[PDB]
Amino acid sequence: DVSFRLSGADPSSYGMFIKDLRNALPHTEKVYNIPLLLPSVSGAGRYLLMHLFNYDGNTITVAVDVTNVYIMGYLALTTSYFFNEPAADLASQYVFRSARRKITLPYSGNYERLQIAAGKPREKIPIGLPALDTAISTLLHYDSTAAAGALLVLIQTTAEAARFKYIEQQIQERAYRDEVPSSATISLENSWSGLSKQIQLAQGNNGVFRTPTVLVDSKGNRVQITNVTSNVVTSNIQLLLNTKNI
Ligand SMILES: C[n+]1cn([C@@H]2O[C@H](COP(=O)(O)OP(=O)(O)O)[C@@H](O)[C@H]2O)c2nc(N)[nH]c(=O)c21
Ligand SMILES: *[C@@H]1O[C@H](CO)[C@@H](O)[C@H](O)[C@H]1NC(C)=O
């Protein structure tokens, strides 16, 4: 399991949590020096538990699929919640079995479905460590509209930060003040599968992507990523979705 406490949290303790989260995901291989997540894992071992504590010390446990960093569901006191999707239903076979009741949220874990439930795109939802404290608190008691927004915050501040060092840094900058995500942040989230695929296809193509990946940069400018020498590959991306899962 990995853990993160909002009480006393600072850029450093958050950085230690995102490092723990990355290090909890198993890999047998690196591709271009980036850990390659596994094609699959059997049974309970497929799921990492993240224990998150709001500023007051209340906690949820979030179940994450270690092959793709997808949040499947979470436990809040004696109630479990899972996304309305087959992979989460399968997860519910393995985690939080001791919950007194299981609620299936009325959406899947897809960014578009979450944004429609929440009533807003994530361009307009501030993220940061204060927003994560709020998200944890919201998820403590069921409210499906409020929870969609909380889950947009939670997914970006945990999974997306584990995946991209830039997103981790964006959150550290927002340790004491929320702010909506930069265009670059949104771009990276949206390209993770694409990037993962192109970095693995590069392995037999002299480091060159079969198909260029288009991103937005730090100044809000649209750039083409064509090969493994790009800073996005050498510095930013920390985990690769296995092409078997693409
Ligand atoms: C396809 N899918 C992607 N995710 C992840 O959940 C978040 C939003 O899902 P998405 O809109 O599919 O992501 P993307 O367009 O950025 O790839 C991102 O972290 C995705 O990696 C997903 N998460 C869940 N729980 N279930 C899914 O089917 C699923
Ligand atoms: C590879 O990527 C770098 C940009 O990161 C660029 O300077 C170079 O022109 C690209 N070359 C090829 C052959 O794709």
Q: How would you describe this structure to a colleague?
A:
Guanine binds at residues 71, 109, 160, 163. InterPro entries: Ribosome-inact_prot_sf, Ribosome_inactivat_1/2, Ribosome_inactivat_prot, Ribosome_inactivat_prot_CS, Ribosome_inactivat_prot_sub1, Ribosome_inactivat_prot_sub2. UTP binds at residues 69, 71, 111, 160, 163. The protein is α+β, with helices and mostly antiparallel strands and 246 residues long. The chain contains eight helices and ten strands. The chain has two domains: 1-162, 3-Layer(aba) Sandwich (Ricin (A subunit), domain 1); 163-246, Ricin (A Subunit), domain 2, CATH 4.10.470. Strands 1-4-5-6-7-8 form a six-stranded mixed beta sheet. A two-stranded antiparallel sheet has the order 2-3. Helix 1 packs across helix 5, helix 1 packs antiparallel against helix 6 (165-173) and helix 5 packs across helix 6. The chain is globular. Strand 4 (47-53) and strand 5 form a beta hairpin. The chain binds 7N-methyl-8-hydroguanosine-5'-diphosphate (M7G) and 2-acetamido-2-deoxy-beta-D-glucopyranose. Residues 208, 226-227, 229-230 line the site of 2-acetamido-2-deoxy-beta-D-glucopyranose.
What oligomeric state best describes the polypeptide chains here?
Answer: monomer
What is the correct CATH architecture of the largest domain? 3-Layer(aba) Sandwich
The total strand number stands at: 10
Rough shape?
globular
Domain tally: 2
GO molecular function: nucleotide binding; rRNA N-glycosylase activity; toxin activity
Organism: Momordica balsamina
Protein name: rRNA N-glycosylase
Family: Belongs to the ribosome-inactivating protein family. Type 1 RIP subfamily.
